[PDB]
Amino acid sequence: QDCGLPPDVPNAQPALEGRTSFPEDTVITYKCEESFVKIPGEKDSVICLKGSQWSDIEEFCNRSCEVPTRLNSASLKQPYITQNYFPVGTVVEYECRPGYRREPSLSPKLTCLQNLKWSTAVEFCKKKSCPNPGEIRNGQIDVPGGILFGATISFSCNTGYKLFGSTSSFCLISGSSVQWSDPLPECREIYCPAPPQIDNGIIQGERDHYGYRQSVTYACNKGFTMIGEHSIYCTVNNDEGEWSGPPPECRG
Amino acid sequence: DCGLPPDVPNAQPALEGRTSFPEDTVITYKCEESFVKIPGEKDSVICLKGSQWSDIEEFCNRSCEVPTRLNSASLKQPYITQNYFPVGTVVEYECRPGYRREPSLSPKLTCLQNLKWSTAVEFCKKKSCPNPGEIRNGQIDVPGGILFGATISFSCNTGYKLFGSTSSFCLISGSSVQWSDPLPECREIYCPAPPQIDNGIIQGERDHYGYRQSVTYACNKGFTMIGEHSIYCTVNNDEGEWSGPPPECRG
């Protein structure tokens, strides 16, 4: 009442599970081979009936391409995203990822070749561009390599100014577009410490704040002699303001 | 002939090594130290007939030496030509060039009883020069005031070069004190135009690059930077030199 090994089917291998005898009614399914994917709505299973006789079954395997290769720019559309049977002459449609944009002139579709390959994908999905970094007052923006999605920029200040904020920004995908990860920082005027007050002398028309390269002029009182640099200026070293040198002396 | 002339207090006859003087021979007496001859008085004798010298009374009086030379002031007329400074004598001074009178102080001097002049005050001060001024991107070193005879030097802030005199002198000029040289100039030492690299560019290029200023490079699409992405203008001996070599844009 049992059947022997099931029939032979081209491009298909029956899943016996190590067994050699199959009891009546036992249903065996065939599994296609590499480069093969069972045709939809096509029987791939036999059923052992009376007289130790397996039912009838005809080739159900066809040649097909593997699942489209993952692309960083575009992702498959429905329902190709869940398919596996890519009979030759089949098209798969892609949809730009986040954050990439479609290149009108290029087709987002793909096709399956004879040696089981695909149509080399174009650049249908380009990288989304970021907003102009802008300008930094008394600072600079280093754009090593463009401002496209995944790009990076760095910040620096002009001599005499200190950096307050982020030293770099990234073009990251935000919502429906790419946006710079951090805000444009600020370059703060590095002010020098209030100039030293000297004995018997004064500061010719002082000042509220002394910045980089700004000088302080000194003047002795009546009956005193100036012995030294008539004035000093502000130097900046490591975002640190420092006076050029020692103030002058007002010898009596 | 007459023998040696008579003896006169505080005075010594100029005989010239002689011992015998022929008639009419006139001999003059020269006062001694601390002694100056009174004006208009006889200071001479004459050998007359009878081997008899002429008459003569004392003609020297006590006096101070000529006022000592002062750097600030110079004697006035007519003291500038006098020599007879009997005690209780006043000489008047007049400021030199270039000194200025000190109102509160007397420019006069008195011949003290001990044949010494009254210690001179500072009636004549040194004339002050005009304020050196301010040097843009430079400095003025006033080692010792700006008075007459003073000296000031000049230097430039880092990044600027000196063009002109390195010093000036408060020399005497006309009827006042004036600086010997003009206030020089400090010229920004500009670096050579930044090198242009292959396959790259200069981010926000500039007209002139000064001290500490930097140039940032960027590679075109498809190229990769090779080296330091920026250079800063250094200055060495009023000479502008780039920090180093520009980056490279490798394809």
Short mmCIF file of C-alpha atoms in Angstrom, two decimals:
data_model
loop_
_atom_site.label_atom_id
_atom_site.label_comp_id
_atom_site.label_asym_id
_atom_site.label_seq_id
_atom_site.Cartn_x
_atom_site.Cartn_y
_atom_site.Cartn_z
CA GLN A 1 0.00 0.00 0.00
CA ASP A 2 3.10 2.19 0.25
CA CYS A 3 4.83 4.01 -2.60
CA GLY A 4 8.54 3.97 -3.43
CA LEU A 5 10.57 7.12 -4.07
CA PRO A 6 8.57 9.77 -5.90
CA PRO A 7 9.13 10.35 -9.61
CA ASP A 8 11.96 12.45 -11.02
CA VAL A 9 11.16 16.04 -11.91
CA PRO A 10 13.57 18.32 -13.77
CA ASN A 11 14.95 21.32 -11.85
CA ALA A 12 13.22 20.03 -8.73
CA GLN A 13 14.22 17.82 -5.81
CA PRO A 14 11.66 16.04 -3.62
CA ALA A 15 11.87 16.57 0.13
CA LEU A 16 11.74 13.00 1.42
CA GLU A 17 13.20 13.65 4.87
CA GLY A 18 15.47 10.61 4.74
CA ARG A 19 12.58 8.19 4.16
CA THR A 20 12.29 5.52 1.47
CA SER A 21 8.75 4.32 2.09
CA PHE A 22 5.68 6.53 1.91
CA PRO A 23 2.29 5.49 3.26
CA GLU A 24 -0.73 5.99 1.05
CA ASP A 25 -1.92 9.60 0.87
CA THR A 26 1.53 10.81 1.91
CA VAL A 27 2.07 14.06 0.01
CA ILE A 28 5.54 14.98 -1.14
CA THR A 29 6.53 18.43 -2.40
CA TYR A 30 9.36 19.21 -4.79
CA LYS A 31 11.78 22.07 -4.26
CA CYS A 32 13.15 23.91 -7.29
CA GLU A 33 16.90 24.18 -7.77
CA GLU A 34 19.22 27.19 -7.96
CA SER A 35 18.28 29.67 -10.70
CA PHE A 36 14.81 28.18 -10.39
CA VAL A 37 11.62 29.42 -8.78
CA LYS A 38 8.38 27.45 -8.90
CA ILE A 39 5.76 29.06 -11.15
CA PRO A 40 2.79 30.55 -9.36
CA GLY A 41 -0.47 28.58 -9.44
CA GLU A 42 1.53 25.50 -10.47
CA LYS A 43 1.35 22.20 -8.63
CA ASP A 44 4.61 21.10 -7.04
CA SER A 45 3.32 18.15 -5.02
CA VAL A 46 2.41 14.53 -5.59
CA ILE A 47 0.12 12.33 -3.50
CA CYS A 48 0.70 8.60 -3.16
CA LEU A 49 -2.57 6.89 -4.04
CA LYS A 50 -3.79 3.31 -4.46
CA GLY A 51 -1.54 0.70 -6.08
CA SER A 52 1.65 2.32 -4.80
CA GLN A 53 1.17 5.01 -7.44
CA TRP A 54 2.29 8.62 -7.06
CA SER A 55 -0.03 11.19 -8.65
CA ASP A 56 0.95 13.14 -11.76
CA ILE A 57 3.27 16.15 -11.74
CA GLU A 58 4.83 18.27 -14.48
CA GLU A 59 7.81 20.67 -14.40
CA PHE A 60 6.93 23.66 -12.25
CA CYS A 61 10.35 25.27 -12.05
CA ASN A 62 11.46 28.21 -14.17
CA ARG A 63 14.64 30.29 -14.48
CA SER A 64 14.76 33.52 -12.48
CA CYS A 65 17.01 36.21 -11.02
CA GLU A 66 17.73 36.48 -7.32
CA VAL A 67 16.06 39.23 -5.31
CA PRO A 68 17.18 42.63 -6.58
CA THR A 69 20.33 43.69 -4.76
CA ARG A 70 19.91 46.21 -1.96
CA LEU A 71 20.56 49.77 -3.06
CA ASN A 72 21.47 52.55 -0.71
CA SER A 73 19.60 55.17 -2.78
CA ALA A 74 16.36 53.40 -3.70
CA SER A 75 14.19 50.70 -2.16
CA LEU A 76 11.87 48.37 -4.08
CA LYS A 77 8.20 49.16 -4.49
CA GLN A 78 5.13 46.96 -3.98
CA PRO A 79 4.79 44.26 -4.61
CA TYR A 80 8.28 43.42 -5.87
CA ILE A 81 9.54 43.93 -2.33
CA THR A 82 7.94 40.63 -1.29
CA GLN A 83 8.46 38.65 -4.50
CA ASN A 84 11.06 35.98 -5.30
CA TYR A 85 9.97 34.63 -8.69
CA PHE A 86 11.76 36.85 -11.15
CA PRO A 87 11.16 35.18 -14.48
CA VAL A 88 13.35 36.67 -17.16
CA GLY A 89 12.02 39.87 -18.76
CA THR A 90 10.69 41.05 -15.39
CA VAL A 91 10.81 44.64 -14.17
CA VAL A 92 11.16 45.79 -10.60
CA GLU A 93 10.33 49.36 -9.65
CA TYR A 94 12.38 51.30 -7.12
CA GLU A 95 11.52 54.28 -4.96
CA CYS A 96 14.11 56.73 -3.64
CA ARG A 97 15.25 56.25 -0.05
CA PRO A 98 15.72 58.81 2.70
CA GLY A 99 17.15 61.03 1.79
CA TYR A 100 17.60 60.74 -1.97
CA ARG A 101 15.81 62.36 -4.91
CA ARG A 102 14.65 60.98 -8.25
CA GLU A 103 16.60 61.83 -11.38
CA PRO A 104 13.77 62.42 -13.88
CA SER A 105 15.90 61.49 -16.89
CA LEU A 106 16.68 58.06 -15.38
CA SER A 107 14.46 54.97 -15.01
CA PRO A 108 13.98 53.59 -11.49
CA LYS A 109 13.16 50.18 -12.96
CA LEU A 110 15.31 47.05 -13.47
CA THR A 111 15.35 43.89 -15.67
CA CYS A 112 16.50 40.26 -15.53
CA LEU A 113 19.14 38.75 -17.89
CA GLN A 114 19.87 35.38 -19.58
CA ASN A 115 22.92 34.37 -17.48
CA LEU A 116 20.71 35.15 -14.53
CA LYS A 117 21.74 38.73 -13.99
CA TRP A 118 20.16 42.19 -13.81
CA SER A 119 20.24 45.43 -15.78
CA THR A 120 22.99 47.52 -14.17
CA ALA A 121 21.19 50.16 -12.14
CA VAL A 122 21.57 53.81 -13.09
CA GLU A 123 21.63 56.76 -10.71
CA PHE A 124 17.88 57.30 -10.80
CA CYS A 125 18.05 58.21 -7.11
CA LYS A 126 20.56 60.97 -6.39
CA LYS A 127 21.64 62.21 -2.96
CA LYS A 128 19.52 65.01 -1.52
CA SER A 129 21.32 68.36 -1.25
CA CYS A 130 21.61 70.39 1.94
CA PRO A 131 20.95 74.11 2.41
CA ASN A 132 23.91 76.45 1.94
CA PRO A 133 25.89 76.28 5.18
CA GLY A 134 25.86 80.08 5.10
CA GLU A 135 28.43 82.54 6.42
CA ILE A 136 30.02 82.81 9.87
CA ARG A 137 30.70 86.30 11.19
CA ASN A 138 34.41 86.41 12.05
CA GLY A 139 34.62 82.67 11.38
CA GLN A 140 34.89 80.21 8.50
CA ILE A 141 33.10 77.14 7.17
CA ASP A 142 35.23 74.29 5.83
CA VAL A 143 33.26 72.33 3.25
CA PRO A 144 35.66 69.45 2.66
CA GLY A 145 33.42 67.74 0.10
CA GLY A 146 30.13 69.38 -0.86
CA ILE A 147 26.91 69.73 1.13
CA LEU A 148 25.03 66.70 -0.19
CA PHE A 149 23.26 64.23 2.10
CA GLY A 150 25.86 62.61 4.35
CA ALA A 151 28.20 65.57 3.91
CA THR A 152 30.17 67.23 6.68
CA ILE A 153 31.34 70.74 7.43
CA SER A 154 33.57 72.17 10.13
CA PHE A 155 33.83 75.56 11.78
CA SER A 156 36.70 77.81 12.80
CA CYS A 157 37.14 81.43 13.90
CA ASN A 158 39.34 84.25 12.69
CA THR A 159 42.34 85.23 14.74
CA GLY A 160 41.08 87.21 17.73
CA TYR A 161 37.74 85.39 17.98
CA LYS A 162 36.72 82.37 20.04
CA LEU A 163 34.44 79.53 18.95
CA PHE A 164 31.19 79.04 20.84
CA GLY A 165 29.08 76.09 19.75
CA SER A 166 29.58 72.99 17.61
CA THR A 167 32.85 72.54 15.72
CA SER A 168 31.16 70.50 13.01
CA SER A 169 27.79 69.80 11.42
CA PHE A 170 26.40 66.86 9.44
CA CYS A 171 23.89 66.75 6.60
CA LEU A 172 21.55 64.16 8.07
CA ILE A 173 18.08 63.10 7.01
CA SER A 174 15.52 64.84 9.19
CA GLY A 175 11.87 64.55 8.16
CA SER A 176 11.08 64.68 4.45
CA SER A 177 14.53 66.11 3.72
CA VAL A 178 18.16 66.27 4.81
CA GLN A 179 19.07 69.00 7.30
CA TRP A 180 22.36 70.07 8.95
CA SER A 181 22.82 68.30 12.30
CA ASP A 182 24.00 71.36 14.22
CA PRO A 183 23.48 75.12 14.08
CA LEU A 184 26.03 77.62 12.84
CA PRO A 185 28.10 78.42 15.92
CA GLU A 186 29.39 81.84 17.01
CA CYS A 187 32.80 83.51 16.97
CA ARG A 188 33.14 85.72 20.07
CA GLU A 189 35.53 88.67 20.22
CA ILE A 190 38.35 87.72 22.57
CA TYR A 191 38.69 90.82 24.72
CA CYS A 192 41.90 91.58 26.61
CA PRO A 193 42.01 92.14 30.37
CA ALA A 194 41.55 95.78 31.43
CA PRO A 195 44.85 97.58 30.87
CA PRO A 196 47.00 98.05 33.95
CA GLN A 197 46.77 101.43 35.68
CA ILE A 198 50.18 103.04 36.19
CA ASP A 199 51.52 105.28 38.95
CA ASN A 200 51.87 108.99 38.20
CA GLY A 201 50.43 108.35 34.75
CA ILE A 202 47.15 107.83 32.92
CA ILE A 203 45.66 106.18 29.83
CA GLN A 204 45.19 108.75 27.06
CA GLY A 205 41.45 108.44 26.34
CA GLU A 206 40.82 104.95 27.69
CA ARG A 207 38.32 102.44 26.33
CA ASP A 208 35.51 100.09 27.34
CA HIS A 209 36.87 96.98 25.64
CA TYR A 210 40.20 96.28 24.01
CA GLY A 211 40.21 93.60 21.33
CA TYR A 212 42.86 92.10 19.06
CA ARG A 213 45.60 94.49 17.92
CA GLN A 214 43.97 97.37 19.77
CA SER A 215 46.39 99.61 21.67
CA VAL A 216 46.36 101.54 24.92
CA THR A 217 48.24 104.84 24.99
CA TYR A 218 49.80 106.06 28.23
CA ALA A 219 50.72 109.51 29.49
CA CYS A 220 52.62 110.67 32.55
CA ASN A 221 51.41 113.46 34.78
CA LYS A 222 53.15 116.83 35.06
CA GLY A 223 56.53 116.53 36.77
CA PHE A 224 57.01 112.90 35.72
CA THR A 225 59.11 111.28 33.03
CA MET A 226 57.93 108.48 30.77
CA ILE A 227 60.38 105.59 30.65
CA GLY A 228 59.19 102.90 28.29
CA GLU A 229 56.77 102.04 25.53
CA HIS A 230 54.44 104.95 24.92
CA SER A 231 51.60 102.43 24.59
CA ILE A 232 50.81 98.71 24.54
CA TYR A 233 48.53 96.62 22.35
CA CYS A 234 46.35 93.55 22.78
CA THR A 235 47.62 90.21 21.50
CA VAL A 236 45.55 87.04 21.29
CA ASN A 237 46.91 83.57 21.92
CA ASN A 238 44.63 80.56 22.19
CA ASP A 239 41.38 82.48 22.43
CA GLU A 240 43.17 84.19 25.31
CA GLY A 241 43.72 87.94 25.25
CA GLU A 242 47.12 89.11 26.50
CA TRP A 243 48.68 92.59 26.57
CA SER A 244 51.66 93.20 24.33
CA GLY A 245 53.95 93.88 27.30
CA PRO A 246 54.35 95.78 30.56
CA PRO A 247 52.94 99.28 30.78
CA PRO A 248 55.40 102.17 30.94
CA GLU A 249 56.75 103.78 34.09
CA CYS A 250 56.22 107.37 35.21
CA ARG A 251 59.42 108.28 37.01
CA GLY A 252 59.33 111.45 39.13
CA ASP B 1 116.79 154.91 35.35
CA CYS B 2 114.50 153.72 38.17
CA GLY B 3 114.87 150.55 40.20
CA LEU B 4 112.04 148.08 40.74
CA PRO B 5 108.61 149.72 41.04
CA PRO B 6 106.99 150.23 44.42
CA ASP B 7 105.03 147.52 46.22
CA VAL B 8 101.25 147.51 45.82
CA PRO B 9 98.89 145.31 47.82
CA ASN B 10 97.07 142.56 45.91
CA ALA B 11 98.97 143.51 42.75
CA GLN B 12 102.18 142.33 41.08
CA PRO B 13 104.09 144.48 38.59
CA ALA B 14 104.90 142.94 35.21
CA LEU B 15 108.61 143.71 34.92
CA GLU B 16 109.36 141.16 32.19
CA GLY B 17 112.55 139.94 33.89
CA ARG B 18 114.07 143.44 33.93
CA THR B 19 115.63 145.27 36.87
CA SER B 20 116.40 148.65 35.33
CA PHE B 21 113.74 150.84 33.74
CA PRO B 22 114.57 153.83 31.55
CA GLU B 23 112.80 157.11 32.25
CA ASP B 24 109.20 157.27 31.01
CA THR B 25 109.09 153.47 31.21
CA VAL B 26 105.52 152.60 32.22
CA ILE B 27 104.87 149.58 34.41
CA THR B 28 101.42 148.11 35.00
CA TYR B 29 100.36 146.09 38.05
CA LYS B 30 98.22 142.96 37.75
CA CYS B 31 95.81 142.17 40.62
CA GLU B 32 96.05 138.77 42.30
CA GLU B 33 93.58 135.88 42.60
CA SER B 34 90.22 136.85 44.10
CA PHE B 35 91.10 140.40 43.13
CA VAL B 36 89.84 142.50 40.22
CA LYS B 37 90.86 146.07 39.37
CA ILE B 38 88.38 148.84 40.09
CA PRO B 39 87.28 150.51 36.90
CA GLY B 40 88.78 153.93 36.12
CA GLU B 41 91.42 153.75 38.85
CA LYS B 42 95.13 153.96 38.12
CA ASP B 43 96.83 150.56 38.08
CA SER B 44 100.14 151.79 36.66
CA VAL B 45 103.29 153.70 37.54
CA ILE B 46 105.80 155.57 35.44
CA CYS B 47 109.48 156.03 36.08
CA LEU B 48 110.12 159.78 36.10
CA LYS B 49 113.07 162.06 36.64
CA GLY B 50 114.93 161.47 39.90
CA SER B 51 114.59 157.69 39.63
CA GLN B 52 111.15 158.30 41.09
CA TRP B 53 108.10 156.20 40.25
CA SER B 54 104.70 157.93 40.06
CA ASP B 55 102.23 157.87 42.95
CA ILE B 56 99.53 155.25 43.39
CA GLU B 57 96.96 154.07 45.92
CA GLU B 58 95.30 150.66 46.26
CA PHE B 59 93.16 149.90 43.21
CA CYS B 60 92.15 146.23 43.60
CA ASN B 61 88.96 145.14 45.40
CA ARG B 62 87.58 141.70 46.29
CA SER B 63 85.46 140.01 43.61
CA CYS B 64 83.87 136.78 42.31
CA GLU B 65 85.21 135.06 39.21
CA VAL B 66 83.16 135.23 36.02
CA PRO B 67 79.85 133.45 36.55
CA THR B 68 80.21 129.77 35.71
CA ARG B 69 78.89 128.60 32.37
CA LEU B 70 75.38 127.19 32.59
CA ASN B 71 73.86 124.88 30.01
CA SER B 72 70.39 126.34 30.43
CA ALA B 73 70.92 130.08 30.55
CA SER B 74 73.45 132.58 29.27
CA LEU B 75 74.48 135.87 30.86
CA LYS B 76 72.83 139.09 29.69
CA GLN B 77 74.37 142.46 28.86
CA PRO B 78 76.50 143.80 30.06
CA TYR B 79 77.56 141.21 32.63
CA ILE B 80 78.60 139.00 29.70
CA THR B 81 81.67 141.19 29.24
CA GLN B 82 82.40 142.14 32.85
CA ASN B 83 85.08 140.80 35.19
CA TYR B 84 84.78 143.10 38.21
CA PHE B 85 82.22 141.40 40.43
CA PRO B 86 82.47 143.29 43.69
CA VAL B 87 80.56 141.50 46.46
CA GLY B 88 76.83 142.19 46.42
CA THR B 89 76.77 142.11 42.61
CA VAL B 90 73.91 140.60 40.60
CA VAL B 91 74.24 139.06 37.17
CA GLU B 92 71.19 138.35 35.07
CA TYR B 93 70.73 135.27 32.95
CA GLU B 94 68.74 134.57 29.83
CA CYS B 95 67.47 131.10 28.85
CA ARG B 96 69.52 129.36 26.16
CA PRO B 97 68.29 127.38 23.16
CA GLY B 98 66.22 125.66 23.84
CA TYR B 99 65.24 126.25 27.46
CA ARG B 100 62.29 128.05 29.02
CA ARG B 101 62.07 130.43 31.98
CA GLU B 102 60.56 129.19 35.23
CA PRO B 103 58.49 132.22 36.33
CA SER B 104 58.72 131.30 40.01
CA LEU B 105 62.53 131.32 39.91
CA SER B 106 64.98 134.24 39.65
CA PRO B 107 67.43 134.20 36.74
CA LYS B 108 69.80 136.41 38.72
CA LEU B 109 72.89 135.49 40.74
CA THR B 110 74.60 137.15 43.67
CA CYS B 111 78.31 137.40 44.44
CA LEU B 112 78.50 136.20 48.03
CA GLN B 113 80.83 137.64 50.65
CA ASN B 114 83.19 134.71 50.20
CA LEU B 115 83.75 135.54 46.54
CA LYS B 116 81.29 132.82 45.51
CA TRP B 117 78.11 133.12 43.44
CA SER B 118 74.71 132.18 44.91
CA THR B 119 73.79 128.61 44.00
CA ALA B 120 71.82 128.87 40.78
CA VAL B 121 68.24 127.60 40.72
CA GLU B 122 66.47 125.98 37.76
CA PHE B 123 65.14 129.28 36.40
CA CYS B 124 65.70 127.90 32.91
CA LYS B 125 64.04 124.54 32.37
CA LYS B 126 64.38 122.30 29.32
CA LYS B 127 61.94 122.97 26.50
CA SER B 128 59.42 120.17 25.94
CA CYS B 129 59.00 118.62 22.49
CA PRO B 130 55.63 118.06 20.84
CA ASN B 131 53.91 114.77 21.69
CA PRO B 132 55.54 112.05 19.57
CA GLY B 133 52.04 111.04 18.51
CA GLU B 134 50.67 107.60 17.67
CA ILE B 135 51.94 105.14 15.08
CA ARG B 136 49.28 103.06 13.35
CA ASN B 137 50.17 99.39 13.81
CA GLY B 138 53.46 100.48 15.39
CA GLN B 139 54.83 101.71 18.73
CA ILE B 140 56.79 104.65 20.12
CA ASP B 141 59.39 103.94 22.80
CA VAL B 142 59.92 107.03 24.96
CA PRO B 143 62.88 105.85 27.05
CA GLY B 144 63.28 109.17 28.89
CA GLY B 145 60.62 111.84 28.24
CA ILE B 146 60.36 114.13 25.20
CA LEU B 147 62.32 117.14 26.53
CA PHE B 148 65.04 118.84 24.47
CA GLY B 149 67.84 116.34 23.81
CA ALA B 150 65.39 113.45 24.21
CA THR B 151 65.24 110.33 22.06
CA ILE B 152 62.44 108.07 20.89
CA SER B 153 62.53 104.88 18.88
CA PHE B 154 59.98 103.19 16.64
CA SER B 155 58.86 99.60 16.12
CA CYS B 156 55.98 97.87 14.34
CA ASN B 157 53.39 95.38 15.56
CA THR B 158 53.92 91.79 14.39
CA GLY B 159 52.76 91.46 10.79
CA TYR B 160 53.76 95.00 9.84
CA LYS B 161 57.07 96.23 8.43
CA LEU B 162 58.91 99.44 9.33
CA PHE B 163 59.34 102.09 6.64
CA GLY B 164 61.34 105.15 7.64
CA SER B 165 63.56 106.14 10.56
CA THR B 166 63.92 103.79 13.50
CA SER B 167 64.53 106.73 15.84
CA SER B 168 64.05 110.48 16.27
CA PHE B 169 65.78 113.18 18.34
CA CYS B 170 64.23 116.21 20.02
CA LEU B 171 66.78 118.53 18.45
CA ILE B 172 66.83 122.32 18.65
CA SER B 173 64.90 123.87 15.76
CA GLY B 174 64.40 127.59 15.16
CA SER B 175 62.71 129.13 18.21
CA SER B 176 61.55 125.89 19.81
CA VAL B 177 62.20 122.16 20.24
CA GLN B 178 61.53 119.79 17.32
CA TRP B 179 61.90 116.09 16.49
CA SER B 180 64.77 115.21 14.15
CA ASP B 181 62.82 112.71 12.05
CA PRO B 182 59.23 112.15 10.98
CA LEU B 183 56.94 109.45 12.37
CA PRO B 184 57.65 106.42 10.16
CA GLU B 185 55.10 103.97 8.77
CA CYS B 186 54.21 100.36 9.49
CA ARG B 187 53.25 98.53 6.33
CA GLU B 188 51.24 95.31 6.42
CA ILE B 189 53.46 92.44 5.31
CA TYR B 190 51.27 90.64 2.77
CA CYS B 191 51.92 87.01 1.85
CA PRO B 192 52.39 85.84 -1.73
CA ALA B 193 49.20 84.81 -3.52
CA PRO B 194 48.25 81.32 -2.34
CA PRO B 195 49.24 78.48 -4.65
CA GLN B 196 46.52 77.13 -6.91
CA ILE B 197 46.13 73.38 -6.66
CA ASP B 198 45.10 70.81 -9.25
CA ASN B 199 41.57 69.42 -9.04
CA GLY B 200 40.84 71.72 -6.11
CA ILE B 201 39.99 75.31 -5.25
CA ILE B 202 40.28 77.93 -2.53
CA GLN B 203 37.20 78.31 -0.35
CA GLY B 204 36.25 81.99 -0.25
CA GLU B 205 39.43 83.31 -1.87
CA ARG B 206 40.80 86.72 -0.90
CA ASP B 207 42.52 89.82 -2.30
CA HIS B 208 45.29 90.03 0.29
CA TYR B 209 46.43 87.59 2.94
CA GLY B 210 48.13 89.09 5.98
CA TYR B 211 49.73 87.71 9.11
CA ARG B 212 47.91 84.79 10.72
CA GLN B 213 45.31 84.80 7.94
CA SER B 214 44.51 81.41 6.42
CA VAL B 215 43.45 79.95 3.09
CA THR B 216 41.14 76.91 3.04
CA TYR B 217 41.27 74.42 0.17
CA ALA B 218 38.61 72.13 -1.29
CA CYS B 219 38.78 69.29 -3.81
CA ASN B 220 36.37 69.14 -6.75
CA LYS B 221 33.81 66.35 -7.04
CA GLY B 222 35.39 62.90 -7.36
CA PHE B 223 38.69 63.99 -5.86
CA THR B 224 40.15 63.33 -2.42
CA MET B 225 42.21 65.83 -0.39
CA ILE B 226 45.81 64.87 0.34
CA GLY B 227 47.47 66.85 3.13
CA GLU B 228 46.62 69.78 5.38
CA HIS B 229 43.35 71.33 4.26
CA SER B 230 44.53 74.86 5.00
CA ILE B 231 47.58 77.08 5.37
CA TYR B 232 48.21 80.19 7.42
CA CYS B 233 50.31 83.18 6.39
CA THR B 234 53.40 83.42 8.58
CA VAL B 235 55.80 86.34 8.68
CA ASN B 236 59.54 86.11 9.09
CA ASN B 237 61.73 89.17 8.74
CA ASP B 238 59.14 91.47 7.21
CA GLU B 239 58.79 88.63 4.73
CA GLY B 240 55.40 86.94 4.23
CA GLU B 241 55.62 83.15 3.88
CA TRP B 242 52.81 80.56 3.75
CA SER B 243 52.59 78.08 6.62
CA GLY B 244 53.63 75.31 4.21
CA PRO B 245 52.53 73.38 1.12
CA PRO B 246 48.95 73.34 -0.14
CA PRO B 247 47.01 70.10 0.04
CA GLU B 248 46.74 67.75 -2.94
CA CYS B 249 43.59 66.66 -4.75
CA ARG B 250 43.99 63.01 -5.58
CA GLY B 251 41.51 61.56 -8.10
#
